[PDB]
Amino acid sequence: DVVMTQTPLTLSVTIGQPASISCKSSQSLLDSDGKTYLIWLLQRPGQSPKRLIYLVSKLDSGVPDRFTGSGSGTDFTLKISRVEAEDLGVYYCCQGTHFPFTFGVGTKLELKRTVAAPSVFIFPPSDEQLKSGTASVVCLLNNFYPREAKVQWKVDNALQSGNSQESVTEQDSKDSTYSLSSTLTLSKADYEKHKVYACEVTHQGLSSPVTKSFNRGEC
Amino acid sequence: EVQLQQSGPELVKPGASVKISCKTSGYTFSNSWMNWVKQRPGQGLEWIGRIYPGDGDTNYNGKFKDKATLTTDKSSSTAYMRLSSLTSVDSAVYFCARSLFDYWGQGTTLTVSSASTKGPSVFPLAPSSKSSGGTAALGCLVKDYFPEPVTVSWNSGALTSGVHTFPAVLQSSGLYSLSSVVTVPSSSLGTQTYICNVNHKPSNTKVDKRVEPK
Ligand SMILES: [Cl-]
Ligand SMILES: [Cl-]
Secondary structure, three states: OOOOEEEEEEEEOOOOOEEEEEEOOOOOOEOOOOOOOOOEEEEOOOOOOOEEEEOOOOOOOOOOOOOEEOOOOOOOEEOOOOOOHHHEEEEEEOOOOOOOEEEOOOOEEEEOOOEEEEEEEEOOOOHHHHHHOOOOEEEEEEEEOOOOOEEEEEOEEEEEOOOOEEOOOOOOOOOOOOEEEHHHHHHOHHHOOEEEEEEEEEEEOOOOOOOEEEEOOOO | EEEEEEEEOOOOOOOOOOEEEEEOOOOOOHOEEEEEEEEEEEOOEEEEEEEEEOOOOOEEHHHHOOOOEEEEEEEOOOEEEOOOOOOHOOOEEEEEEEOOOOOOOOOEEEOOOOOEEEEEEEEEEEEOOOOOOEEEEEEEEEEEOOOOOEEEEEEHHHHOOOOOOOOEEEOOOOOOOEEEEEEEEEEHOOOOOOOEEEEEEEHHHEEEEEEOOO
């Protein structure tokens, strides 16, 4: 196969600043017909890839002018004059000169921005879930940066260990922040035996940890 | 505009075959190559092969020559990909893409597994005082389903401001869960309509759950 090697594999850029990604093909992409069938694609999380650049340097319709493509032979570059928040995603080079057509591994473009503390929200289990015989307590950390955060659960002032799971969104395409959900899983019986449910959040942007809590039955 | 509309998600047993479709519109189907592409974690984007609908010419990736068969129906402007002797390594998202990958379908998620479908349980994340100043939060929990995928929207897609849908996460004991939340002005609580629309096509489970303060 023609191997497509991209550099860097992760690109961390502050909004408004230039960025570039290079691609090396293991065989020249110059075809017998004079054209060089090198394209660049962007894939946002949960979406299909979209072509941005083709024949090395031609821009697809609707692609901002800040994207340019260059190169020849085996070495190609995608350049972004100024990264905007909506440029985040995974960029792939791809060749269509030689069978089988092949893709690079992808370069993840992530955005740097200023520290932002999370807003914190806590949710008791729904009566419907309780009526169904289980219980999830959820703590939401919204619109924060950087991605790293600590979430500690306490039930009746007892520190919880090993009974929660966190999930983090992809970086936001408008403000470059993240959001994080922490689910504390207890049996319905355990949930009904305790009163105070609290999640304590520590983040670089918080001077002091933030705690949100509720008391079961104190609606 | 050019449109490539693929068939829905598939759950199939090991050893079976499956046929995925790509129905096109907005250009002359007979005069463009149609490619098929696999996307799987660890394998990346892999080109399976292509077919030229005007004359049935095909080129395959040798890696997939014994796995995939491409055909077309000019009457319905539809391209097909049949995958045979399926194994877990075939679980992936498959895309159709035109010409030099200039337009792509939305993808088809294929899961190869002996498991049966299980629809999600959908629970409200109910707002209250305990979900900050002038901002409140609400959401929906989409729990314990199989296989991928599930789609989630709010108010049939009319609500996008403040929406965060978390990734599906495969849990240790084999099922998936995700959640979707919305942050809104606290004034909107109990006054504005918030409906989370959950669709799990493999189980034919469609839920439109109204989320209200508890
Ligand atoms: Cl800072
Ligand atoms: Cl449907």
